[PDB]
Amino acid sequence: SSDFLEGEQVEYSRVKIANRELEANGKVGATYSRDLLGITKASLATESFISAASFQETTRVLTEAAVAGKRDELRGLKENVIVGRLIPAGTGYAYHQDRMRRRA
DNA sequence: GGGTATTCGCCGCGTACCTCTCCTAGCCCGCAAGTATCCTATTCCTTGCAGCGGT
């Protein structure tokens, strides 16, 4: 009863939360099979494309993201360094917690 | 077509600092400088025409 196409490779967190919340209703969840990728391939296949771009081979990831029209939302420890704001890691965690709890 | 092997081409290979050197090639057109040449004088000689005393 989910929406994912048959052969999609989807982030584990998205599918886990979608199934977990759907079962609260009368829907049947999706079935997934975990996959292992070497780090060099794992860091590139990330939701936040600035993290990938700062890593190796910017050209490929950047063109692919541009075509797909992605939209990065600045949650890692690296893109927040690039933009120049507090990290959501150490003392800045309280600030980011309040920031989330205010806008939302 | 189809499963397979083989080849081609792209991607990647540590951080921080110190000293030194060198950074387009070739054409072209105005232009400064330096020079050989050409016109400018002086002195000698032998003509050609206009005044001019003289009768």
Residues lining strand B, beta carbon within 7 angstroms: A 56-60
Residue that has been written with the tokens 């690039």 in this structure: A82
Documented resolution in Å: 3.5
CA of A78 to C1' of B41 (A): 99
Q: Which nucleotide is nearest to A58 (CA to C1')?
A: B11
Elucidation method? cryo-EM
From residue A81, alpha-carbon distances to A49, A77, A88, A89 in Å are 14, 7, 10, 11
Taking the C1' atom of every nucleotide in all shown strands and the CA of A57, the nearest one is B11
